[PDB]
Short mmCIF file of N, CA and C in Angstrom, two decimals:
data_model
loop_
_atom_site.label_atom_id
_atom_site.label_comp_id
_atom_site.label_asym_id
_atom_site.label_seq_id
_atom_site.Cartn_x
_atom_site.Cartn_y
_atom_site.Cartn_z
N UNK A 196 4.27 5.79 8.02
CA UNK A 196 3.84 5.90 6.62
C UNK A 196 5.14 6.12 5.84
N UNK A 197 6.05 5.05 5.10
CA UNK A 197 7.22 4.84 4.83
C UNK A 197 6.87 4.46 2.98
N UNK A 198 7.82 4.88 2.43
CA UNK A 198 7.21 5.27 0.50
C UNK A 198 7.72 3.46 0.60
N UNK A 199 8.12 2.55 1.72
CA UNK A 199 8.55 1.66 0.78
C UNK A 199 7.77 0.29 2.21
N UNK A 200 6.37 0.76 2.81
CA UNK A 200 6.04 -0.20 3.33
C UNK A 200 4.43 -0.74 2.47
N UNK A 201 4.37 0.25 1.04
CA UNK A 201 3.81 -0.01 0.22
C UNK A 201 1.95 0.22 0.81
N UNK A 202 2.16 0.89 2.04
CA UNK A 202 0.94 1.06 2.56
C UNK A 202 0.05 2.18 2.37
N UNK A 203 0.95 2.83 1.18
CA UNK A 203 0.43 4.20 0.88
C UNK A 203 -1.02 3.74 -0.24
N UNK A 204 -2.20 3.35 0.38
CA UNK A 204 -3.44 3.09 -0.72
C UNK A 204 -3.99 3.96 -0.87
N UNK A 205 -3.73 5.22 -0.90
CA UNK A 205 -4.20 6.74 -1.14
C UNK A 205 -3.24 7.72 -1.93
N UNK A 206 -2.86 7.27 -2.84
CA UNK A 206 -1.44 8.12 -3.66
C UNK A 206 -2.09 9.34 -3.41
N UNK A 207 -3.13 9.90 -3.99
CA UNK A 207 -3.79 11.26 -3.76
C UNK A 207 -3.73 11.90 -2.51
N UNK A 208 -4.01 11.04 -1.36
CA UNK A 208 -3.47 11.36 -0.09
C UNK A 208 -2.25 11.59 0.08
N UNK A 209 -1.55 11.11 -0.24
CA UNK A 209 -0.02 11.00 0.38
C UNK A 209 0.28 12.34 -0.64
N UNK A 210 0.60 12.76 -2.12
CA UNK A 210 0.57 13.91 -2.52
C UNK A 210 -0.01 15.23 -1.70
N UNK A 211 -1.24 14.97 -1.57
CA UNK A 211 -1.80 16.48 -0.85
C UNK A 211 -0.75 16.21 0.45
N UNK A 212 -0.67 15.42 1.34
CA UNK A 212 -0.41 15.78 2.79
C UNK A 212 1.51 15.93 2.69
N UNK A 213 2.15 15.79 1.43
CA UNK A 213 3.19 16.14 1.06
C UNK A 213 3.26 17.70 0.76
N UNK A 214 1.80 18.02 0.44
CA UNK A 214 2.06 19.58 -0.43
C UNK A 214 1.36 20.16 0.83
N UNK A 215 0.72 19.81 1.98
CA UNK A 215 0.60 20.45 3.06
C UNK A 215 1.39 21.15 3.90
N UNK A 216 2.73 20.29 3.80
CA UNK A 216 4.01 20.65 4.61
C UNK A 216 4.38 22.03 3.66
N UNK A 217 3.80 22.07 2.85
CA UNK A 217 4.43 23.87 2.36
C UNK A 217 4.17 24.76 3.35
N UNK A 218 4.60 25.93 3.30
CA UNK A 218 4.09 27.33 3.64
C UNK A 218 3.82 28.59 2.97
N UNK A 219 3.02 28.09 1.76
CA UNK A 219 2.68 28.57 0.83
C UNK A 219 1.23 29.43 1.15
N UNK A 220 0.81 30.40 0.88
CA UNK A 220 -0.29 31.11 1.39
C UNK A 220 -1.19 29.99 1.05
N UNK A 221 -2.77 30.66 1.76
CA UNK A 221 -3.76 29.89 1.24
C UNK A 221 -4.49 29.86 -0.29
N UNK A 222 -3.91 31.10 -1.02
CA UNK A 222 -4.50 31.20 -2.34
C UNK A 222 -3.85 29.82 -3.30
N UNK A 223 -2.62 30.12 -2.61
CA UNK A 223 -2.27 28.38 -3.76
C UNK A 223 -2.66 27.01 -3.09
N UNK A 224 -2.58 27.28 -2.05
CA UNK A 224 -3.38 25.96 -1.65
C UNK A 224 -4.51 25.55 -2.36
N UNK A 225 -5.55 26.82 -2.56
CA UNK A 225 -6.99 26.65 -3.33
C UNK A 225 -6.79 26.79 -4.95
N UNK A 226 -5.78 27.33 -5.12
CA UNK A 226 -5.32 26.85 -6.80
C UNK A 226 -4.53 25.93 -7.15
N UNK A 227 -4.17 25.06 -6.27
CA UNK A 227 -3.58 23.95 -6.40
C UNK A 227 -4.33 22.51 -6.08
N UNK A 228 -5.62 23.06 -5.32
CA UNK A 228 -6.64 22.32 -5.27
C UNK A 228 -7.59 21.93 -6.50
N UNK A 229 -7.77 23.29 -7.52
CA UNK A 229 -8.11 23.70 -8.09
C UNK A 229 -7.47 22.78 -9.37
N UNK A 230 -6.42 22.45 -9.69
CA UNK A 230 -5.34 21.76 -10.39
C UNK A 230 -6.27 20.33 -10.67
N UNK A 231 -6.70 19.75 -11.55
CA UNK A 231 -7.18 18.79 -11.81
C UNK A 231 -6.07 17.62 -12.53
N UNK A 232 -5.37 17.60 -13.63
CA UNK A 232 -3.97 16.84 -13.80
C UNK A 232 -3.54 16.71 -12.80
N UNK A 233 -2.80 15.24 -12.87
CA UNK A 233 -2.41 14.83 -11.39
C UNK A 233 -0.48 15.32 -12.42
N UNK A 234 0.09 15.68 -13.12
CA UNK A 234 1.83 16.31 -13.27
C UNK A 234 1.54 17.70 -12.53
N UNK A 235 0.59 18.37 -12.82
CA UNK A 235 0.74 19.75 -13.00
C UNK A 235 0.36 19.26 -11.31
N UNK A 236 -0.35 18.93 -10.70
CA UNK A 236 -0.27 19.33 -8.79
C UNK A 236 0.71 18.88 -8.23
N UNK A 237 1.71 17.69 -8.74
CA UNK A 237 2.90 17.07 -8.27
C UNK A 237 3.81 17.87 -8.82
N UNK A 238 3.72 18.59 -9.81
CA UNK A 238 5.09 19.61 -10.37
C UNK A 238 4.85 20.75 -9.54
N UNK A 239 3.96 21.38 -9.18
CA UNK A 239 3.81 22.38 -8.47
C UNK A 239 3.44 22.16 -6.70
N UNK A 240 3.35 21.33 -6.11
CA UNK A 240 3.51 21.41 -4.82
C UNK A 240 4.70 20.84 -4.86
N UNK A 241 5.31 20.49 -5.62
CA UNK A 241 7.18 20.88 -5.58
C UNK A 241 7.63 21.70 -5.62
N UNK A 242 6.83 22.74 -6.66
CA UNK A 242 7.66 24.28 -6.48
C UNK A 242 7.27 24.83 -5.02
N UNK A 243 5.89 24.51 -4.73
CA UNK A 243 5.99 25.63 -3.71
C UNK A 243 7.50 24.83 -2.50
N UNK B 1 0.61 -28.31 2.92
CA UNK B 1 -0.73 -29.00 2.38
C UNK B 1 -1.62 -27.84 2.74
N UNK B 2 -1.81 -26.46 2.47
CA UNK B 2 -2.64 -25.31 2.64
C UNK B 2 -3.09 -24.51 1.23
N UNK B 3 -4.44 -24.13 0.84
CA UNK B 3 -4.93 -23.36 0.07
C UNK B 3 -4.29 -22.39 -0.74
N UNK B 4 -4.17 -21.79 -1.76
CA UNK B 4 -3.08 -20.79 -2.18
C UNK B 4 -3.78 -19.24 -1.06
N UNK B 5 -2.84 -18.44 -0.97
CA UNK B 5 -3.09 -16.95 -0.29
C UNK B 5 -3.08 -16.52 -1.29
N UNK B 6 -4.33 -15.06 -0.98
CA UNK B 6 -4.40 -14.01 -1.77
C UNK B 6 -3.36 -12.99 -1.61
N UNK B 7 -2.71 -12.99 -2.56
CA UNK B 7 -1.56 -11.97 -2.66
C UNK B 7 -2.17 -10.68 -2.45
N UNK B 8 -2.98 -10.51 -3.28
CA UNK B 8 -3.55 -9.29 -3.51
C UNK B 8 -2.39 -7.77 -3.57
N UNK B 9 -1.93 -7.53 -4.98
CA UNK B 9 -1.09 -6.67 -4.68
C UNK B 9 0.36 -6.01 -4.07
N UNK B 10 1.03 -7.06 -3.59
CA UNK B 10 2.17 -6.99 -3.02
C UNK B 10 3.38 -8.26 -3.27
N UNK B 11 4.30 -7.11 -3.46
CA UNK B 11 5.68 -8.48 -4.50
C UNK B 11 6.20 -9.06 -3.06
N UNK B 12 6.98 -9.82 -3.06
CA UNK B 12 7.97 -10.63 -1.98
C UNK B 12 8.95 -10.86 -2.93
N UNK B 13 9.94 -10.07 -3.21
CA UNK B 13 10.81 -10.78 -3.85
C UNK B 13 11.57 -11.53 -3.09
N UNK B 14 12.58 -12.93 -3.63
CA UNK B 14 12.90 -13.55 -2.50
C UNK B 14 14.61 -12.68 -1.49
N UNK B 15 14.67 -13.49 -0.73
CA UNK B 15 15.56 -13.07 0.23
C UNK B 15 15.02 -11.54 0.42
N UNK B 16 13.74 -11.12 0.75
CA UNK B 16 14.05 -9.92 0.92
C UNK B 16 12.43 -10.14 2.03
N UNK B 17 12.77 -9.20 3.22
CA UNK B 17 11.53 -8.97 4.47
C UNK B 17 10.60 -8.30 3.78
N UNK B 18 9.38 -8.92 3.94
CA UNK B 18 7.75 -7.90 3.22
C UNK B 18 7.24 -8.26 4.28
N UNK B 19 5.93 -6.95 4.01
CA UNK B 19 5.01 -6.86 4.88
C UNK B 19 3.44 -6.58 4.11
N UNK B 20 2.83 -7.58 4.64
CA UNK B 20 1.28 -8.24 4.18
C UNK B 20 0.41 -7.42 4.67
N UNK B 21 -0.46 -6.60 3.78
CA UNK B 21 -1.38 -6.45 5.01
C UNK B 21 -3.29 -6.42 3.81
N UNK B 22 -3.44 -8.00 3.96
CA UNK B 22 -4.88 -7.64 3.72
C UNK B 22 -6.13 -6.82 4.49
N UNK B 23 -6.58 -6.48 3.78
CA UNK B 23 -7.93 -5.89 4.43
C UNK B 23 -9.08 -7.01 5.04
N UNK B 24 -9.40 -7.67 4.47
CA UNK B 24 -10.04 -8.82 5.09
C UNK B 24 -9.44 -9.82 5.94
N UNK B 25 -10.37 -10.13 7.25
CA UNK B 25 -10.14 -10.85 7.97
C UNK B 25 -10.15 -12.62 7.80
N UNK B 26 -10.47 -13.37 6.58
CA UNK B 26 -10.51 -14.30 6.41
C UNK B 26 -9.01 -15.23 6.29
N UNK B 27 -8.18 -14.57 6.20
CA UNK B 27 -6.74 -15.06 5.66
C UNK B 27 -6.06 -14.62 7.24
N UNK B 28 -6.66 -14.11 8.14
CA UNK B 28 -5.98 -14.50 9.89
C UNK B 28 -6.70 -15.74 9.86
N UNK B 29 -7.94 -16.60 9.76
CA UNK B 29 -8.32 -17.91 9.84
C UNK B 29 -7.41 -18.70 9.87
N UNK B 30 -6.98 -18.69 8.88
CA UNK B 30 -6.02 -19.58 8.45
C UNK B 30 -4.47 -19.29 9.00
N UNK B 31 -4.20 -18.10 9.78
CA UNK B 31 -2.93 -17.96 10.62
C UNK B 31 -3.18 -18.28 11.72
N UNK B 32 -4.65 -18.66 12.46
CA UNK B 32 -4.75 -18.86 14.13
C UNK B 32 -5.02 -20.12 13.47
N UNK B 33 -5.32 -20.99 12.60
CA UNK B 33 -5.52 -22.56 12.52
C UNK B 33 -4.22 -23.81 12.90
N UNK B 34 -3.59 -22.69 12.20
CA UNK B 34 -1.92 -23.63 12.29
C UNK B 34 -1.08 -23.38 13.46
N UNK B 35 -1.72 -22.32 14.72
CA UNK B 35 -0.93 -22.30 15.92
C UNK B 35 -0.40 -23.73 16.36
N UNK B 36 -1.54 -24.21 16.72
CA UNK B 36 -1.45 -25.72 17.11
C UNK B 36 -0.51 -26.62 16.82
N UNK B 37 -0.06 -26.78 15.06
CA UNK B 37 0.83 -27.51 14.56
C UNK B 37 2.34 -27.73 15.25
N UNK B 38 3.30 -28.49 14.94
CA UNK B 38 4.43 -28.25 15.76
C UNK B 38 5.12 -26.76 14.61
N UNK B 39 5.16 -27.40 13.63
CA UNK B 39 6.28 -26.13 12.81
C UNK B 39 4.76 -25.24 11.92
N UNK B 40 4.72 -24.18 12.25
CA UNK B 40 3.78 -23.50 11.25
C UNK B 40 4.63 -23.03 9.83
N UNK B 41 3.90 -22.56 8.85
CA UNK B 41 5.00 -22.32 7.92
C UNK B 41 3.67 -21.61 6.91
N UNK B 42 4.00 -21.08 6.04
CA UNK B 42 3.55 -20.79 4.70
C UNK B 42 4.02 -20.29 3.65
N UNK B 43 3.64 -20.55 1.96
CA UNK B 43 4.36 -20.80 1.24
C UNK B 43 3.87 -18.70 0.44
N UNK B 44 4.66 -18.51 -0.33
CA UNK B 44 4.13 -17.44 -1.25
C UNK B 44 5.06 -17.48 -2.78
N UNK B 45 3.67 -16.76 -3.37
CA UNK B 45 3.52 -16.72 -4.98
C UNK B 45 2.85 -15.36 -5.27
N UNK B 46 3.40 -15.96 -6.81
CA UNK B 46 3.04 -14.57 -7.92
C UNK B 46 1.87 -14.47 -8.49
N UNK B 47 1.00 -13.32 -8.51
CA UNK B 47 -0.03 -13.10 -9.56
C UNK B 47 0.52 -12.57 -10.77
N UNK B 48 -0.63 -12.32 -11.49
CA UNK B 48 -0.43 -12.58 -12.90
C UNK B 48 -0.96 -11.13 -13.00
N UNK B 49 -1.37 -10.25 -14.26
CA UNK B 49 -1.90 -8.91 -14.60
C UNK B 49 -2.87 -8.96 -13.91
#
């Protein structure tokens, strides 16, 4: 799963399983779930 | 002398390796038809909006 074999047909997928690799407790996981704007969940499973 | 392919979504710019991958099986038809031939070949193009 390579950003440039264009096979990513789940952008939403590929974001969450990017913000999975955190080790961020589970409360932000569920407030980041919680996050409906798709800047504000891509700006913030960057911070974490 | 073959049908146009559905692009569906994916550039080829030239001189450069891409990789195809429809979801439907109708467009392998037409890749096991031309085994047979001596030179197989096929052509690609651009969609539009």
């Amino acid at each position: 799963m390579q950003a440039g074999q264009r096979v990513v047909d789940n952008p939403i997928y590929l974001s969450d399983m990017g913000a999975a690799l955190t080790g961020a407790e589970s409360h932000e996981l569920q407030d980041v779930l919680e996050e409906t704007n798709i800047p504000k969940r891509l700006y913030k499973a960057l911070s974490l | 002398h073959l049908p146009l392919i559905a692009i569906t979504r994916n550039p080829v710019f030239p001189r450069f390796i891409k990789i195809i991958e429809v979801k439907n099986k109708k467009l392998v038809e037409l890749l096991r038809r031309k085994v047979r031939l001596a030179q197989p070949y096929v052509g690609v193009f651009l969609k539009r909006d």
